[PDB]
Amino acid sequence: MFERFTDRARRVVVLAQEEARMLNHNYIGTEHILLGLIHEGEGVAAKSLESLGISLEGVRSQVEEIIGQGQQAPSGHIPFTPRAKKVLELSLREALQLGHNYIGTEHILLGLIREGEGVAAQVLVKLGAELTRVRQQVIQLLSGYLE
């Protein structure tokens, strides 16, 4: 199903792996998806998070606080966590229900808050972005693009 991801959504997922690698992490978790959505910096997900005051630095600090880094950066393919897998599966249905045949950055973000339980969700709540508020912000920005 990655073939239905937009270019930018694929770049998100590719960057999430490197977010994990550069923290000396050995799985790609939901929090690395969150880092990648913000760090890629152009799509509706990034805009939605910026517009709620969720910054790359705030997320990095919470990931250091909650997870911490390993001793060494791994080479080769880093596997998705169970919850990251769930997020990416959910993203497909967020896209279809919003009337899209491709999975964009916003649908990954929506999948992440739909999953609602892993490290990224914990970080968003800690930083003051309640999951319903995040969802409604995405809907609000998408509605503005219908003009």
């Binding site: 199903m1 792996q17 897998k85």
Partner: peptide, 7 residues
Amino acid sequence: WLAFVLV
């Protein structure tokens, strides 16, 4: 799909 980037 769905274990690694991008399988």
